[PDB]
């Protein structure tokens, strides 16, 4: 049974994104409490947020298999981390975020668009900074 | 121009669901180099990762207008956050996780259906846990 292709992959990616979200989402939801006072409560969306990390990596390590989720590309060493990032980095930057600024203007969302660019000129940031690092690579 | 049914809500949730797995990716690239020993690597996807969460979160305080991605149910209280917790979660233990524990073993992969089981007794475990949380909360 090869992973690539299955449905399994599929799920596995699913499963990742759902877990990446829980994490984010727990997070937000602790810092809510955090204001509110609700320590404990706060303290649980922390704990249980730890679980979601250990999961989607759970899910992230079987995706060696098949390749990173965010482009296609493999990953693992240093190397091709930098560089899967990279080319997701620049999708967002050249792509995605441009694109999704253009759409909220367009349907009357100006401070969603001016956050899309915000977010446009941050992941180009981030993948100039990528690049470097990986022309710093020593492996 | 109101959000709920928008393109923009709907980037706002692809978006929400990329910059999460991008903090989840990054910090499994970090924990790669860690062990590599590219310690500056690691740091510089560990800072990276901290952009992530702040782009995450900043997606979805905008979806507070239109309810939690997971789970379409409304959140900004702890009341709130754990009702839509709570009703993730039970999706997740009663339907995703079983529903791909199923496919993985039907399509031959027993030790990824055994992983899956694991994190539907898990997400039941979180679902619980925050069960109770919501029974002792006073606000």
């Not at 930098?82 to 203007?105: C, N, V």
């Not at 969603?112 to 180009?124: C, S, V, Y």
């Not at 100039?128 to 020593?138: E, F, I, M, P």
């Given at each position: 049974?090869?992973?690539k292709?299955?449905?399994?992959?599929?799920?596995?990616?699913?499963?990742?994104?759902?877990?990446?979200?829980?994490?984010?989402?727990?997070?937000?939801?602790?810092?809510?409490?955090?204001?509110?006072?609700?320590?404990?409560?706060?303290?649980?969306?922390?704990?249980?947020?730890?679980?979601?990390?250990?999961?989607?990596?759970?899910?992230?390590?079987?995706?060696?298999?098949?390749?990173?989720?965010?482009?296609?590309?493999?990953?693992?060493?240093?190397?091709?981390?930098?560089?899967?990032?990279?080319?997701?980095?620049?999708?967002?930057?050249?792509?995605?975020?441009?694109?999704?600024?253009?759409?909220?203007?367009?349907?009357?969302?100006?401070?969603?668009?001016?956050?899309?660019?915000?977010?446009?000129?941050?992941?180009?940031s981030?993948?100039?900074?990528?690049?470097?690092?990986?022309?710093?690579?020593?492996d």
């Open positions: 049974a090869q992973l292709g299955s449905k399994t992959e599929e799920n596995l990616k699913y499963a990742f994104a759902g877990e990446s979200q829980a994490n984010r989402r727990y997070l937000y939801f602790a810092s809510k409490a955090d204001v509110e006072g609700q320590n404990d409560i706060a303290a649980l969306f922390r704990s249980t947020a730890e679980g979601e990390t250990g999961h989607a990596h759970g899910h992230l390590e079987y995706l060696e298999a098949v390749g990173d989720p965010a482009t296609g590309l493999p990953f693992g060493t240093s190397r091709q981390n930098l560089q899967s990032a990279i080319a997701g980095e620049t999708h967002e930057y050249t792509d995605m975020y441009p694109g999704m600024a253009k759409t909220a203007r367009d349907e009357g969302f100006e401070e969603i668009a001016n956050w899309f660019e915000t977010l446009a000129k941050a992941e180009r981030h993948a100039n900074r990528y690049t470097k690092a990986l022309d710093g690579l020593v």
